[PDB]
Amino acid sequence: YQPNYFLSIPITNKKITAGIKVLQNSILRQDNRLTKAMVGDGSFHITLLVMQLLNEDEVNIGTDALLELKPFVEEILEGKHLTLPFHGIGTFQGQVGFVKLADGDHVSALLEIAETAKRTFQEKGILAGESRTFKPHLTFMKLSKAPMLWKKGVRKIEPGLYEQFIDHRFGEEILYQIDLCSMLKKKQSNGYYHCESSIVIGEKDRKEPEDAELVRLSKRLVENAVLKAV
Amino acid sequence: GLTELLQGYTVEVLRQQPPDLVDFAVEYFTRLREARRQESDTFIVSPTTFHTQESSAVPVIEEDGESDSDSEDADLEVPVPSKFTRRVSVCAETFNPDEEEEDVVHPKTDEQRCRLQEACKDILLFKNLDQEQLSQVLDAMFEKIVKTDEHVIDQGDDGDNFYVIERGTYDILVTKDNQTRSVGQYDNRGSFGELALMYNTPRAATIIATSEGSLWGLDRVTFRRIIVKNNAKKRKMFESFIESVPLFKSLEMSERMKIVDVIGEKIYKDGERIIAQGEKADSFYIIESGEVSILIRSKTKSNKNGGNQEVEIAHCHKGQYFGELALVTNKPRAASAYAVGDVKCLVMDVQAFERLLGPCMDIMKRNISHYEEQLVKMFGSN
Amino acid sequence: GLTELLQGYTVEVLRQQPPDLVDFAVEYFTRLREARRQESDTFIVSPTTFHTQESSAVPVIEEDGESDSDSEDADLEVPVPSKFTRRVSVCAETFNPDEEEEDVVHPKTDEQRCRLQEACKDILLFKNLDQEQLSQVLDAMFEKIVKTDEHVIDQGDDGDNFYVIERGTYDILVTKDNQTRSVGQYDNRGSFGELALMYNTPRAATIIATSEGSLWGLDRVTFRRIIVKNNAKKRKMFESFIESVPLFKSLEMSERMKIVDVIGEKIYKDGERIIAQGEKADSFYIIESGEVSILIRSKTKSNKNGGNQEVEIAHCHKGQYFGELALVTNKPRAASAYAVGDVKCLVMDVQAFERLLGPCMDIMKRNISHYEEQLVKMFGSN
Amino acid sequence: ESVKEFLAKAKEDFLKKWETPSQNTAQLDQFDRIKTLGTGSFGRVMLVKHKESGNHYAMKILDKQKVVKLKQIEHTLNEKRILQAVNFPFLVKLEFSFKDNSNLYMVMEYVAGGEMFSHLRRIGRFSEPHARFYAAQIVLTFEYLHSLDLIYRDLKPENLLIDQQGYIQVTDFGFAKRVKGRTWTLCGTPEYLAPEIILSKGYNKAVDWWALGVLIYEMAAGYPPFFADQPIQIYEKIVSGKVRFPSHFSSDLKDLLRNLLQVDLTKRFGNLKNGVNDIKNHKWFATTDWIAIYQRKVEAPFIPKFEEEIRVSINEKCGKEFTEF
Amino acid sequence: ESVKEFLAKAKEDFLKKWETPSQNTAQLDQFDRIKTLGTGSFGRVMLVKHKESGNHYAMKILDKQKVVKLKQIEHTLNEKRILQAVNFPFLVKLEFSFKDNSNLYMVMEYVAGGEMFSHLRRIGRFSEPHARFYAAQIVLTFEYLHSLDLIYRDLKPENLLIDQQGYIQVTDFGFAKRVKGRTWTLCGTPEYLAPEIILSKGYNKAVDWWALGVLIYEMAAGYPPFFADQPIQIYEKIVSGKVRFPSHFSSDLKDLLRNLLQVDLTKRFGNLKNGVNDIKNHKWFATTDWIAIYQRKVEAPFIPKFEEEIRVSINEKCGKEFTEF
């Protein structure tokens, strides 16, 4: 089926979106007619779940299902933040360019969240999810967005264009907000998709409300140093 | 463990803000290395036991065996004491008393023979034997040498000899029923087996030598023959002296033998008095050797006084007799009689004579044609 | 540097795969510390000091040397010179001349005394003393024994005695200013210190004995008293003989003393002539002892011739006087006068008498009621 | 008196049979055989019955050969000659005698009675009257025997039988001997030996009388006068002649016994001047009727209670010496 | 003549004061004190002034106690009695006398003049006219004194003072003594002693005249007639009487001197019949106006040039003997 709505994980880490902006611009200085293929500033996201919401009631139902999903995602994470590392570049058959999600324990957790999301929405009467394997990625360009490119000889993304960013660490996004977004409505002023509703996973997010305080950071500093040593 | 290890360090860096990162790491990880207290030592001593038990009675019993003890106690038992035994006859070997016809030589020193006599004084068979027979008997005693451990006589065995000890020591043994007792010993003195000289009979005891010794032995047959022969010779001789005495001619053979049986003998040394004038006339004599002088002190011839000296009325010799008047009267002896040299007379008691043959006067009359003659002889002149 | 530090450790843990991360951290961080360099050995140290002084001083004090004196220095003599020209009056000890009332015994042989006289002949004080006074004086001389080396007199010392040497030798010394000279010696002869008999005065020389010696000494006081006493006795005696002479009765006391002062004495031995007839009449006599015979040779009685022998006109004794006419006339002696025995007369020169008292005739007239008497005495008969 | 008559006729009858012994009289086939009481320790005596008369007799079996050993063979050939020549009421009888290769068979009379030894021992001792009764019989028997110059020499309870009439019957003439003069064999029974026998002085009739004294004493006392455990002591007592009589013995008895048990032959009853009359006339025998005892008319005081097959040799052996028989 | 008048009135005046000495006259508080010239070698003489009259006198201080020693204490108690009794123009004067615990104080007149000894020695010798001038004064003084039987005994330049009028004034009566008869103390001055004094012959007025001869000689010669370095020699010369006169001595002088220096008393001027007139009438004194010299009307030939504080004893001491004073 053709989805018209999706659950979105927005990219809020400014380093990630700034790195992608650089990537997009470097491609454009090599070939400026790729301009309309680039995804818009402010639109960067990971798609968690696609669906069809076909009327006002169903849009309300989607919003209800998103709210109902919150405790489930909290259950799944078992008191740990979900960290999504974005590293390197890939394509879907040379037509869609994306920043890759790095391999790790987070991928299975993300998949679990996606499947629980699909179940939660379907149990509320919403056609959601797909039969194909969930392969999350962070899109930065799509040739289909610029139809005149075929019409003038550009029919695939030249792999040389993004060669320098092939092992570029864009940054890490911690899961917090999940948005219910319209694919077809007018985008927000800041470039992001039209949002019907949002939830926040985070507590926000800690096992304990009271400050440690900053005791955990030692964990973040160490884990990051170990990741860099690899 | 890597992230957690480095988190402890990093927490302390953030808290403590040390000026040097590396020196703080040396100190932190050195103290963490020091920190572990894991090693431990356990020593265990414990008492383990079972609290309760249940007891059931058992009927079994145990016994032990005492060491064997051996004891012997002398025992006397009498069965049915009776006093009823039948008595068997005994009999010695027969022998022709009357001397067959002259047809035993064992040397002996004076001391040995003298000692044999002493050893024999009290033995009844020897006790009252005359000088001659005793000599012939000792002559007949043969010597028997014995080595130590040897059995002279053994209880039960038949006996033939009588023994006198000459030298040595001996143990005497007597077996009564099943018991044998070492009852007594002999030490170079003694005699035994006298019974064997009478008849053959079982030895009543056993005699064993305990050293080298010597014994004088006498065989029954030899002993009996010596004695019988001699007494039968003496009898014949006595018989003759009675027979040749005319006063006794009317006597029968058996009557002379009764006299021979009891008549005595006496030896007188020259000069010794046989009959004393005045004492009581109890017997009469028959000279068998030597001579006898009959004296009378001529005083009993008147009324008070005279001679009072010595006068020989008669003088008798071998075969003659004197003291005859004691047979026919009862007045004191008329005269004295003295032995003229060595004399041997047969002496007969008058009272015994009468008890055996009755009064002499009757005998004198038996043969009436000689009564007068006899009377004149007895109360006559010469 | 915190993330970089943790990363570097992690890279080596991943490379080395240590089983014990804590031990690996101790070693890793210790080695990291070691690499930093470098320790520096301490430099050698040298100390140097440099200084400049620019001070100028006007004032300093300097003292030098020492004072040493070898010997004491004699005091300077006084400038002023003093000269003395004055002699003190001398004076002997006073004494009551008139004999108090009889109230010095030193033995001496004739030779000794005789020698003392000789030694005294020339001494002025002794030189013209009469016989008696000289005797009394020698009597008063005491002996003084001296041992050799002894000082008889010492220059300067006060003097009281006069000495005559009896025995010994002596050295005389005289000190003039600072010098002493052994000027002379005495050898058993001599005398000295005469001045001491006058008044007390300093000894002018020193006399030392040079051997055992003996000296006769005389004390001033003793000497003066002997002499004064004797002369005062003599005066009283002379005074009396003048006083009892009637011709001089009108004389005043002081006039008699002028006579006493100068009048002489003379001794005459019996028979010697005192006045010779014819010679010039110069003096008159006053007998103080003995008798005097006045003779006249009767020739000057006529005109040429006669007597020319000896005739006694008068005969005077103690207290009387003769030669009186020399006092009133100037004609030769009328007669001679001879001593009758031992005589002592006072002799007065007429010319001296006149110079002292004027002419005798005036004295005779002084007492007018006796003038005639006096005249008849002088120019009369008897 | 008839005493002389009897003895005279007696000597006659005896000398006749003595100087002409009745040899081999009857035949063995006239007698059968019954019991066989004759063992002990010598000889073979068996009972037997007769043919025609059919009487009972005691036959002594003496093998002619059996002889020659033993102690003697004359003390028998002589014994036979005496039994055959003698005849007295108180003496056993030689009824029939015969021999041949068997040789010497004695057919003695038989009295189914009791032994004197068994009777005396049972009751202990006889009363004096009863003892006197038996004694008289022995005195008479000895007078008869001595009349023939025969001495018994073995008197003792053991050799005396009490017949069915209660009278004595003397047996065993083993030592019987005809002696005129003196004899010397030391024989008899210890308890009953005379001093003269023990000492070998020579002897004759006097020993039988001494034995009688012993016999009478034992009957009235129950035990012999010179008893002892050792034979030697018995003889020494016998020789000393000293006798001790029981309290109950009467005076007359003691006196008679002192005279029978006389070691001194000059004082022994039977041996003196009057011979057997000194005994017959003794106060102890005063109530005795000698003729009555002889004819067995007196009433006795006590009536007593009442194997193999041998063959000859078909040949006569030792008959070359046992001729006289 | 008036000479007799004068002497008569003189003796009167003298005997009166002699037999009644004027004792303790004036008071010490009437006299002050000035200089103190009175040392030397004995006594304490100090100048002094008067009160009312305000005159100058010479007071001799004689400590009552100081006495008793020394040489004598009468040659003074006597000296005082004379000074007080005498009165002559050429004699010093005892003006005032007094004592008490101080005792014996002499208030002598004072003439601020010169010593005879100093004057004579300076100029060497006097001309005869000048010598005659002084001599006359001494002759007159001796006539007065001898008139009173007093002898001076110490004549010498040293004891003569020249007053401001140029006339002589005699001092020191230490040896002055009233003697009628003869006296004997050997005293005076060596150079001026008379032979009779040296020899102890006894003497009186004649020694003063001899001394005058010595005094006149020395004045006209400059040195004494018997001079010598040793006292002994002086006396020996004196005794010998031998005198040698200088060349310049006039005849009249030599003659006068030979008569004054006479050892022979029978020839000595002053001692003879006419006494002092033998001297007054001598040719050497011819140009002498005796009255004029007496009244001091003659013109002298030479006008001379012109310390501590003692106290009494508040008590009179030696007054137990110095009564007469």
Author numbering:
A (entry chain A): 88 to 317
B (entry chain C), C (entry chain B): 9 to 111, 116 to 394
D (entry chain E), E (entry chain D): 13 to 318, 332 to 350
Give the original sentences from the paper that presented this experimental model:
The PKA holoenzyme is a tetramer composed of two regulatory subunits (R) and two autoinhibited catalytic subunits (PKAc). The local action of PKA is dictated by A-kinase anchoring proteins (AKAPs) that impose spatial constraint by tethering this kinase in proximity to substrates. The D/D creates a high-affinity binding groove for a canonical amphipathic helix on each AKAP that forms the reciprocal binding surface. Here we have used electron microscopy (EM) to evaluate the topological arrangement of the fully assembled type IIα PKA holoenzyme when anchored to AKAP18γ.
Class averages revealed a remarkable variety of configurations. These ranged from a tightly packed pseudo-symmetric triangular configuration to a fully extended linear configuration of the three densities. However, inspection of particles at various tilt angles showed that particles of linear and triangular conformations remained clearly distinguishable, even at high tilt angles. In both 3D reconstructions, a central mass with dimensions of 60 × 60 × 80 Å (corresponding to the site of AKAP18γ as demonstrated by affinity gold labeling, black triangle and Figure 1D, inset) was flanked on either side by larger densities of 100 × 100 × 85 Å. In the triangular conformation, the two peripheral densities are oriented at a 100° angle with respect to the central density and exhibit an end-to-end length of ∼300 Å (top). Pseudo-atomic models of the pentameric protein assembly in both configurations were constructed by fitting Protein Data Bank coordinates for regions of AKAP18γ and PKAholo subunits (‘Materials and methods’). When AKAP18γ is docked to residues 1–43 of RIIα (RII(D/D)), the resulting sub-structure fits within the central density of maps for both the triangular and extended configurations (yellow). In a similar manner, the peripheral densities each accommodate a PKA sub-structure consisting of one catalytic subunit (blue) in complex with the cAMP-binding domain of RIIα, residues 91–392 (green). Finally these models were completed by connecting the central AKAP18γ–RII(D/D) sub-complex to each RIIα-PKAc unit through a flexible chain corresponding to residues 44–90 of RIIα (‘Materials and methods’).
